[model samples]
Target: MEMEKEFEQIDKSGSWAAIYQDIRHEASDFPSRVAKLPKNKNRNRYRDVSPFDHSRIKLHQEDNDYINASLIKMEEAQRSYILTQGPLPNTVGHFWEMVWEQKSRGVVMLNRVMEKGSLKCAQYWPQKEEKEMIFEDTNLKLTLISEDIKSYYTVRQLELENLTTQETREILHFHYTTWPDFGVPESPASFLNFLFKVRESGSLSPEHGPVVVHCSAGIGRSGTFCLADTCLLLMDKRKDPSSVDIKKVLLEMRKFRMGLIQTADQLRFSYLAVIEGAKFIMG
Candidate 1:
């Protein structure tokens, strides 16, 4: 009742801005010294959006260890999500390497590779006809297994292999194509449908590695997705759904990465999604 009532009053009164500001003002001023290094500058998509040094996932045993990614843990929800930027042109191989090294089972992409005449993200995975690709620098191989297309999203199956050891693992790619960069989705239901599809694979459980989630900048859309998922999980587990603090969860997740839930719209949408998802979770 409290959660729904809060959202109702906010919606009716248009107090979204102040509410979002309350959570954001908790402070995202954490140090990101590693991201400022000259060698790591090119790996970041946006100059202002860099992962915090403490939680940024470093590529193991590499000369240049930066990859513009962060590991966010939601202990209340028992979920770990890797919020990362879309791979840069030079960092695609390192992207796969990070996936392998982190033992991540799935990747949730919230932006298109190209968002107009310009590029938002690199085509990091194997394309249709190509079937497979070899990363010379990382000594990695990726093979595309199956692709299932939908009106607003696409589900792709990929195989990642270590060239030296020949150890292989399956990766699920859930690409929500309809979500525009820095914009909210049309409604909570469509986004939840796509999210449940990813959960159906069961790779997001606590026993597994973090499910890598990314957008062009990896803060706005990606952060919204994780916040909703985390809140919904807490709602599902706790006796009272209203007890789930959506704001607190987002505030907690922001610590691992900088600039999560970028806009007031994104913050509002996160609440809408968790509210909708709570209904399904309980009933």
Candidate 2:
């Protein structure tokens, strides 16, 4: 109804790009010291997309203390997310270790392993045929027990075993495979559908450590997902959907991680997703 046009009003006036520019100017410039250190340099997927030192997640038992991930907390919404880059071949061990340490119950993978003829992400988990893969550095073994494939996404069930302690944790992987490379989905419907699927699992709840949310750089699509999820939730709490400021929400989220909602196109999609989600939630 009129809600859709308000977003279009922003787009029609060229203010979405203006809003994005303002958010960029307002973004945090905190140091990414550990990601810059020579020892951990190779662990980053994109040199420019390193996690800010203040909000970055630290490894407890690993040899190195750094991982290219940040803890994004919107406590009012009771949401916390460990946002990070796609795991590199070497950091896959650190990835699982972070999950184990964080007690994460789910991972929302927003991009495919390979995209547009380039390796956007490593095949971080085991395949059905491979059965299980062990991350020797962290003494964690990942066993893929079930796989559910859909047109745009895949949900896989896996067991994370700490071989040293013989303890295991069941984690679900929510991978949206069809998000165009550095672009938004065709519509917010499918994206919201997948998001609600993750929500239905209650994996985004606070009782769980933090759901591990990642795209290639953990900024663009990853930020979009968190922003949509959190903002829709914030509206649910406030009950005044019109009062929720999408730009303000993005600004708050950007404080913890950099370059969220990369393009004006993605920014528009976020607004659309929030508008679409509010209908489902409020009505």
Candidate 3:
């Protein structure tokens, strides 16, 4: 199949490793802006997890010193994403504030709350039965409207309201539970299905605000998801699946978020997913 041919081409080139090294080399040149931000050292969930000042999302209303989030804009794909770290206990309010401030319609969570007995992310949303939760620090209220639990993923309907203004909007939460931390899915079929589900909801479209995508540190799994989606969109636009350069696409995406596609395995999985997704698009 042509898709298999593309996969073979990717393996034969052996350039992804070189590309990964090149990205790391460039990242070393990034300035130390995050460290200089007031109170950022204490607010960051992880000491090493810091947003690049050139692309970091700033909260105009808040102090803007603590949020570990970056606004990733891909002009070629006409898509924007807020790539952010998992919310810390104290940063939960900032997380919701970013959602409301960015006018994002959905959040694509790629990590589970706990993995291998370690906490990966906070329980940021309300319980399904409780239906609603509020963040007093940010004065934001989150209400769960509906939820669909699946074998490998879960989808929820959430309503976010501003207590100050009493204004509200619906937000979709798409969580892929089966994806292992720092690893890819068992196959591309399940991952592509999840991607298309997000697409069908129109949350990925440019008409809405950038969808917030996050995992533990907000780069590895999150980067894989964005890269695959962007490549498939580019393939659909050009009507030729083979014309898009997978390595070049990843390099381009890394401009918006640092350290995307954390390992060689994840990089390979991205290629596989992109090829598999192209087959569906080409058909």
Candidate 4:
């Protein structure tokens, strides 16, 4: 089946609404496992941004630190992701700590530093002129090695080092600067180009630790990126573009993170991107 036709069928049949309702129902009883602790509450960037107890990513090295993040493992697709919120000033150290602790190869940032005149995310990394920034809390130093600026996105090579252990690792930072919060990109082609750029870096492979994916509040654009990318991967793996069920796949992804695909528009764009991406893969 053609991708657009399938998208229209799914939308007209209200499958998206059904899937969202199921997600809401499941979330109603989302366990209060670790997020309820007094120590962890303040660690969350936003009061509403808290990880579900069941799938919340834990810091094995820290006793009770929480950072509004979740470990999403899509084993069938061989993709693992750390879905998280854009860091707050107070939580920036914890963010890098999670990256270092998890050994993530890349950080996929889908939101800009400032969006709609609001500070959506902290300036977590070092600026170009500064060369390096130190997170005192985590005792980590992040040095900017090189930056490649694109029309809509920017890629940077950063050296992350642990002060105590004197260990260092190279981390790729892929920042999609144009995607607006609570909205879709201008077109699927541009978005697919960005997605493939990240894929080509081999950062999404299962051989590495989960790639860290985040946007403001961690669910809207972040979820869209993961869903579209995962669906495209499944299509390539099956060799039939239409073989994967988008709704079912989204539900499975939400099992690991809450409030993914924030708006109807975002959900619609997921289908659009998946369809367009499948064409690219098939041809």
For residues 1-283, what per-residue lDDT tens digits would candidate 2 score against the true structure? 3457777777677787787788788777888888899998788887888888899999996567889999998867878999999988888888998999999999999988888888988898988746678776577888998989998889989998888889989999998988886567778888998999999988987788899999889998899999999988887888566778777778888889888888888988888888888887877
Task: For candidate 4, write residues 101-138 as lDDT tens digits.
Answer: 88889999988888788898899998774767977657
What TM-score would each prediction reach against the true structure?
0.95, 0.95, 0.91, 0.91
**Which is better, 1 or 4, measured by TM-score?**
1
**Model 3 lDDT, residue 3, Cα:** 47
Please give the CA lDDT of all the candidate structures: 0.84, 0.86, 0.81, 0.83
Ranking by lDDT: 2, 1, 4, 3
CA lDDT, candidate 3, residue 78: 87
> Which stretches of candidate 4 lie above 4 Å from their native place?
1-3, 10-29
Cα RMSD to native, each candidate?
A: 1.6, 1.8, 2.5, 2.3
lDDT of 3 by residue, 1-283 (tens): 3546656664789765775666677653355476556667766766665677788887756455447888878887888889999888878888888888888898999888999899988899988747678786678889898899998899999998988899999999999999865456678888899999999999988778899999999988899999889888998888555678876777776666668878877877987888678777878
TM-score (C-alpha, index-matched) for candidate 3: 0.91
Better of 2 and 4 by lDDT: 2
- Model 2 clashing residue pairs (backbone): none
